[PDB]
Amino acid sequence: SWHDLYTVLTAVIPLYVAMILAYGSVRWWKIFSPDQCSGINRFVAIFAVPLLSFHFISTNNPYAMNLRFIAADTLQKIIMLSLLVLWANFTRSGSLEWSITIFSLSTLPNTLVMGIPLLIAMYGEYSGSLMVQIVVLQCIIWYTLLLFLFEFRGAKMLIMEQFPETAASIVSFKVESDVVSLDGHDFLETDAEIGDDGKLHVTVRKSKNMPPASVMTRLILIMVWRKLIRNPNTYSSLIGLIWALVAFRWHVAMPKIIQQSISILSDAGLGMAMFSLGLFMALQPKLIACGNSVATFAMAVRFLTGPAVMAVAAIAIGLRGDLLRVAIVQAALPQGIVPFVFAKEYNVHPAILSTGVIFGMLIALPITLVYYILLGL
Amino acid sequence: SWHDLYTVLTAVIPLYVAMILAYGSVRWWKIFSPDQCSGINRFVAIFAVPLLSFHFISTNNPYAMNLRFIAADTLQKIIMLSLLVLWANFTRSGSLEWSITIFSLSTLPNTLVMGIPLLIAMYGEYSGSLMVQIVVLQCIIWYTLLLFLFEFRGAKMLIMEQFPETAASIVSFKVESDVVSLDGHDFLETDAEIGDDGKLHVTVRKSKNMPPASVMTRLILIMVWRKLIRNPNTYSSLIGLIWALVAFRWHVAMPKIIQQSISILSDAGLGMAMFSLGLFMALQPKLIACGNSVATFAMAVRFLTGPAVMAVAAIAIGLRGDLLRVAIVQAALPQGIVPFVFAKEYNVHPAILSTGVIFGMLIALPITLVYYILLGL
Ligand SMILES: O=C(O)c1ccccc1C(=O)Nc1cccc2ccccc12
Ligand SMILES: O=C(O)c1ccccc1C(=O)Nc1cccc2ccccc12
């Protein structure tokens, strides 16, 4: 039908209009400097997106979630992680960094900003509720798992670099409150002291055998905790979830004054997010960075494997009707911004993630419309 | 009543919440740098406020304006300008810069951003329509008159500095397209050539007798035109007015796609404007700049003379009922941002205007509520 296509275009075009206004402001008319661009982008990340997340999560009933949809979204990632573990351990070509990159490319799309409007336009509001559930699960669990993997990689690198042979003896790790992460952008001294028992205790402070799993688990937990409490999305998600539980349990309503105080800043969310994406597009040198073959492989993964694995998982679970179409089209979305931020922070194939986010945002309208049409027959 | 006070507080508090969030981000938690602050502020000025103006103006019917309200708002400024001309010409203590500053302090409040919500909360939506009419008149006429006065001052200064004695002979001025203003921040050479007729022609190019009024008028018109076409508010106001005329004449409706493309960026307007005001508050060194006595005089002017002159003009015109209260409370609003921008640009008592905007924004809630209560009896 043509009315459906017009409705999808009406929903989706203004986001691209904002994106291209930002792109032209930086590129054609030169209205903003790189520092002003960074200021706008930091405002977006700190305030606008987290408040949008609080607005969406705090309004969705957590007692009425769909269990089969959650199970399918979980089984996709379980399948991918099982395949990646098999490949990484039983194939000499395997590696942890490529496993993380493939998992992010194939499992974690942009769901909050453009997913909800696009899916509401395509299928209705209940699709918006399903996308909100997906957002909650990504924010609480899978982003946390990404933090765990990145911190484990950093800790392994530090331990190998510092204690090539003594890594088996160490039993205790002490991290001073100054340290906040193990990205490798800080000068991390590592003192070693011999205890009365004859073992070695380690203190990591800001300036091939591994230790037993217990001390590694303790260290990873400490560092994940330290990064988790400095994350605006953590507070937004947790406070929104707790408020939703209390409100839908006791039917409590927020006072109008607090609600308006939140809304006045939440209303800028979608527009400022699209503007920030346009700024990111304008700041980079080339629209394609990784290259022709690598970009082709990344796009193929994102737009075929994710949908295919989702199809297999959804058929195995027993999804049918329009839930299956929603799941597939959601899996065919462009790649999310949070994994791209993590790739920047830890420098793990950031160019592929950049190509994903930007180029897939550009080409998702035709690809997603093709999925819509083929599934709609 | 207490319900009315609660409603006004509900309408007004979230603006202050956004302002204080920006203030704390810059001052207490140090989230933004001065350059990032400038980027956010420039985004606000270029995009958010102009699109908010287009949204408000393009939706207000220009065939149903109130003529007595317009006449009262015009007569206030006519009275003030007559008094200032008398004082400036017939008193040795008079001056043009002080006349401009007093006119701005006593006539031109912040009407677009906080005036419309506050007045709608106090009196209803029709008050919002009246405030929209006031916004239109300020944007088209009085801001243009301020530009004329500032450019006349700049031209007089340039002519006196360059041609102390020959200013009477010159008959023709040529300004090269490179020049855009006469603020004094540019190195403006002034070539003089003798014509065959024996008169002197002048070319002002980027690097006590006045000339006849005709050449001065021509020069002022050229420069006012050059600054008028580089002003986002000019385009927003003119296009909104033309669209409103056409739409309310032929009942044409904008297509949903264009309307949403505008709205996605207009929705950030009020919140980003309050955030920018908070940033301006945080960036300055002292909340009071001009001093105790000068600040007292400026506040007294803003919050007593404007209301008093408006009362006299509204009684003379014949305003009664609630229109009179609306006019007085509108006159008691804090000082507008555009005259403050002009004072920055031309360096004409900018500190007094800064105190006006910021401190009056802080203290307008009690003062304006006092006006509300006293008029409400
Ligand atoms: O990665 C995502 O897109 C995502 C998915 C589900 C829930 C939240 C997010 C999320 O934080 N987005 C963003 C974070 C920071 C900056 C962003 C700028 C633009 C768009 C999304 C952003
Ligand atoms: O001066 C005013 O407040 C005004 C009055 C009527 C119509 C428009 C305006 C106006 O452009 N405001 C502003 C311009 C530029 C930046 C601003 C930032 C914050 C608030 C208002 C702003």
Short mmCIF file of all heavy atoms in Angstrom, two decimals, chain A residues 44-45 49 53 109-113 135 138-139 143 233 273-274 276-277 280 336-339 341, ligand 1:
data_model
loop_
_atom_site.label_atom_id
_atom_site.label_comp_id
_atom_site.label_asym_id
_atom_site.label_seq_id
_atom_site.Cartn_x
_atom_site.Cartn_y
_atom_site.Cartn_z
N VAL A 44 23.58 16.40 25.02
CA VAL A 44 22.65 15.36 24.61
C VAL A 44 22.86 14.11 25.45
O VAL A 44 21.94 13.64 26.13
CB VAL A 44 22.80 15.06 23.11
CG1 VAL A 44 21.88 13.92 22.69
CG2 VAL A 44 22.51 16.30 22.28
N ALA A 45 24.10 13.63 25.52
CA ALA A 45 24.39 12.38 26.22
C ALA A 45 24.06 12.48 27.70
O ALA A 45 23.48 11.55 28.28
CB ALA A 45 25.85 12.00 26.02
N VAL A 49 19.15 12.22 26.30
CA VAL A 49 18.89 10.79 26.14
C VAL A 49 18.55 10.12 27.47
O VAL A 49 17.58 9.34 27.51
CB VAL A 49 20.08 10.11 25.43
CG1 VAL A 49 19.93 8.60 25.47
CG2 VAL A 49 20.18 10.59 23.99
N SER A 53 15.04 8.23 28.26
CA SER A 53 14.97 6.86 28.77
C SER A 53 14.11 6.79 30.03
O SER A 53 13.30 5.87 30.18
CB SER A 53 16.37 6.34 29.06
OG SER A 53 17.05 5.99 27.87
N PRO A 109 21.05 -3.19 18.29
CA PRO A 109 20.75 -2.09 17.37
C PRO A 109 20.38 -0.80 18.10
O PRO A 109 20.37 -0.73 19.33
CB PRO A 109 19.56 -2.64 16.57
CG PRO A 109 18.87 -3.55 17.51
CD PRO A 109 19.91 -4.12 18.43
N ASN A 110 20.06 0.23 17.32
CA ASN A 110 19.64 1.52 17.87
C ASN A 110 18.15 1.32 18.06
O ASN A 110 17.39 1.28 17.11
CB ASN A 110 19.92 2.66 16.89
CG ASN A 110 19.32 3.98 17.34
OD1 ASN A 110 19.01 4.84 16.51
ND2 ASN A 110 19.15 4.14 18.64
N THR A 111 17.75 1.23 19.32
CA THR A 111 16.38 0.87 19.66
C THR A 111 15.61 1.99 20.35
O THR A 111 14.38 2.06 20.21
CB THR A 111 16.39 -0.37 20.56
OG1 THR A 111 17.07 -1.44 19.89
CG2 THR A 111 14.99 -0.79 20.88
N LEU A 112 16.28 2.86 21.10
CA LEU A 112 15.57 3.88 21.86
C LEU A 112 15.14 5.04 20.98
O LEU A 112 13.97 5.45 21.00
CB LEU A 112 16.45 4.38 23.01
CG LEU A 112 15.86 5.51 23.87
CD1 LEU A 112 14.70 5.02 24.71
CD2 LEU A 112 16.93 6.13 24.75
N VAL A 113 16.06 5.58 20.18
CA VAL A 113 15.82 6.85 19.52
C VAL A 113 14.93 6.67 18.30
O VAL A 113 13.84 7.25 18.22
CB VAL A 113 17.15 7.52 19.16
CG1 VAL A 113 16.94 8.65 18.16
CG2 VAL A 113 17.84 8.04 20.42
N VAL A 135 14.40 -2.22 25.22
CA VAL A 135 15.31 -1.19 25.72
C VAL A 135 15.70 -1.49 27.16
O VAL A 135 16.87 -1.36 27.54
CB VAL A 135 14.65 0.20 25.61
CG1 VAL A 135 15.47 1.24 26.36
CG2 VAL A 135 14.50 0.60 24.16
N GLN A 138 18.18 -4.38 27.24
CA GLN A 138 19.51 -3.97 26.78
C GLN A 138 20.21 -3.12 27.83
O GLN A 138 21.41 -3.28 28.08
CB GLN A 138 19.42 -3.18 25.47
CG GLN A 138 19.37 -4.03 24.22
CD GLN A 138 19.15 -3.19 22.98
OE1 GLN A 138 18.02 -3.04 22.51
NE2 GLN A 138 20.22 -2.66 22.43
N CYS A 139 19.48 -2.19 28.46
CA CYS A 139 20.11 -1.27 29.40
C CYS A 139 20.60 -2.00 30.64
O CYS A 139 21.72 -1.78 31.11
CB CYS A 139 19.13 -0.16 29.77
SG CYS A 139 18.71 0.96 28.42
N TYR A 143 24.18 -4.40 28.22
CA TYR A 143 25.16 -3.33 28.37
C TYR A 143 26.07 -3.65 29.56
O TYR A 143 27.27 -3.41 29.51
CB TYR A 143 24.49 -1.96 28.47
CG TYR A 143 23.89 -1.53 27.15
CD1 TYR A 143 22.75 -0.74 27.10
CD2 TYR A 143 24.48 -1.91 25.95
CE1 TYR A 143 22.21 -0.35 25.89
CE2 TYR A 143 23.94 -1.52 24.74
CZ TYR A 143 22.81 -0.74 24.72
OH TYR A 143 22.28 -0.36 23.51
N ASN A 233 22.84 6.63 32.43
CA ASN A 233 21.83 5.66 32.00
C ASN A 233 21.52 4.67 33.11
O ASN A 233 20.37 4.22 33.24
CB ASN A 233 22.31 4.94 30.74
CG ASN A 233 21.23 4.08 30.12
OD1 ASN A 233 20.11 3.99 30.64
ND2 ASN A 233 21.55 3.44 29.00
N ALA A 273 18.91 14.28 19.83
CA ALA A 273 19.63 13.06 19.49
C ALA A 273 19.89 12.98 17.99
O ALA A 273 21.00 12.62 17.57
CB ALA A 273 18.83 11.84 19.97
N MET A 274 18.89 13.30 17.17
CA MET A 274 19.11 13.30 15.73
C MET A 274 20.12 14.38 15.33
O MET A 274 20.96 14.16 14.45
CB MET A 274 17.78 13.51 15.00
CG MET A 274 16.78 12.37 15.16
SD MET A 274 17.48 10.71 15.14
CE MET A 274 18.33 10.69 13.57
N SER A 276 22.59 15.43 17.17
CA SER A 276 23.90 14.93 17.57
C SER A 276 24.41 13.87 16.60
O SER A 276 25.61 13.82 16.30
CB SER A 276 23.83 14.37 18.99
OG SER A 276 25.10 13.97 19.45
N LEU A 277 23.52 13.01 16.11
CA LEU A 277 23.92 12.04 15.09
C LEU A 277 24.38 12.74 13.82
O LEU A 277 25.37 12.33 13.20
CB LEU A 277 22.77 11.08 14.78
CG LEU A 277 22.44 10.05 15.87
CD1 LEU A 277 21.13 9.34 15.56
CD2 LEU A 277 23.57 9.05 16.02
N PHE A 280 27.85 14.01 14.48
CA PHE A 280 28.82 12.92 14.38
C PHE A 280 29.10 12.58 12.92
O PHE A 280 30.25 12.33 12.54
CB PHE A 280 28.31 11.69 15.13
CG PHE A 280 28.49 11.76 16.62
CD1 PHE A 280 27.42 11.52 17.47
CD2 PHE A 280 29.72 12.07 17.17
CE1 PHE A 280 27.57 11.59 18.84
CE2 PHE A 280 29.88 12.14 18.54
CZ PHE A 280 28.80 11.90 19.37
N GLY A 336 23.52 0.22 17.39
CA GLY A 336 23.28 1.14 18.48
C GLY A 336 24.47 2.02 18.80
O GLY A 336 25.61 1.74 18.44
N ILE A 337 24.18 3.11 19.52
CA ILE A 337 25.20 4.10 19.83
C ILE A 337 26.02 3.73 21.06
O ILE A 337 27.20 4.06 21.14
CB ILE A 337 24.55 5.49 19.99
CG1 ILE A 337 23.91 5.94 18.67
CG2 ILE A 337 25.58 6.52 20.46
CD1 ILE A 337 22.48 5.50 18.50
N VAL A 338 25.41 3.06 22.05
CA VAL A 338 26.15 2.71 23.26
C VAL A 338 27.31 1.77 22.98
O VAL A 338 28.41 1.99 23.52
CB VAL A 338 25.19 2.15 24.33
CG1 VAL A 338 25.96 1.59 25.50
CG2 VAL A 338 24.23 3.23 24.80
N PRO A 339 27.16 0.70 22.19
CA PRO A 339 28.33 -0.11 21.85
C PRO A 339 29.39 0.67 21.09
O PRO A 339 30.58 0.39 21.24
CB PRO A 339 27.75 -1.25 21.00
CG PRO A 339 26.28 -1.24 21.27
CD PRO A 339 25.92 0.16 21.60
N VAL A 341 30.03 3.88 21.61
CA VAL A 341 30.70 4.63 22.67
C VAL A 341 31.70 3.73 23.40
O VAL A 341 32.82 4.14 23.70
CB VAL A 341 29.66 5.21 23.64
CG1 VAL A 341 30.34 5.77 24.88
CG2 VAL A 341 28.84 6.29 22.95
O1 LIG C 1 22.65 2.71 22.12
C1 LIG C 1 21.46 3.11 22.03
O2 LIG C 1 21.07 3.69 20.99
C2 LIG C 1 20.49 2.88 23.18
C3 LIG C 1 19.65 1.78 23.14
C4 LIG C 1 18.76 1.55 24.17
C5 LIG C 1 18.69 2.42 25.24
C6 LIG C 1 19.53 3.52 25.28
C7 LIG C 1 20.42 3.76 24.26
C8 LIG C 1 21.33 4.99 24.34
O3 LIG C 1 21.84 5.24 25.38
N1 LIG C 1 21.55 5.84 23.17
C9 LIG C 1 22.41 7.02 23.18
C10 LIG C 1 23.33 7.24 24.19
C11 LIG C 1 24.14 8.37 24.17
C12 LIG C 1 24.04 9.28 23.13
C13 LIG C 1 23.11 9.06 22.10
C14 LIG C 1 23.02 9.98 21.04
C15 LIG C 1 22.11 9.77 20.02
C16 LIG C 1 21.30 8.64 20.04
C17 LIG C 1 21.39 7.73 21.08
C18 LIG C 1 22.31 7.94 22.12
#
